[PDB]
DNA sequence: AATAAGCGGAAGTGGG
DNA sequence: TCCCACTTCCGCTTA
């Protein structure tokens, strides 16, 4: 299965749901999702993993905060904005 | 209060 | 066995 830095990075190649997601600064990675319609987006990840439960964006975002460790996503102090790291953006 | 974003400990599930 | 990569649940903090 895809992990869930790649599911958001894939959308915004692809353009899919750009308006539950999208580029802030591509160059340096930080991407933003939507207030209204950020719940589409999760409902869409948790089908594309076939979870038991409806995904949603605060379980979307508790795994996101996961990532802050290791690096491939960390959280900006900006509304609902997130970076992805060089290495995941290569 | 109502609404919303953000946080993370803890326990459960998947597929190695 | 026991980690992966989340998922689910709950309670809390800040604006
Ligand atoms: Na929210």
Redesign the pocket.
């Known amino acids: 299965?895809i992990?869930?830095?790649q599911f958001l990075l894939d959308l915004l190649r692809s353009g899919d749901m750009k308006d539950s997601i999208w580029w802030v600064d591509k160059d340096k990675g930080t991407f933003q999702?939507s207030?209204k319609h950020?719940e589409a987006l999760a409902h869409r990840?948790?089908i594309q993993?076939?979870?038991?439960?409806?995904?949603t964006?605060?379980?979307?975002?508790?795994?996101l905060?996961?990532?802050?460790k290791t690096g491939e996503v960390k959280?900006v102090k900006?509304?609902?904005?997130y970076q992805f790291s060089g290495e995941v953006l290569g």
């Open positions: 299965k992990r869930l830095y999702f207030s950020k990840w948790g993993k076939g979870n038991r439960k409806k995904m964006y605060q379980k979307m975002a508790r795994a905060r996961n990532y802050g959280k900006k509304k609902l904005t």
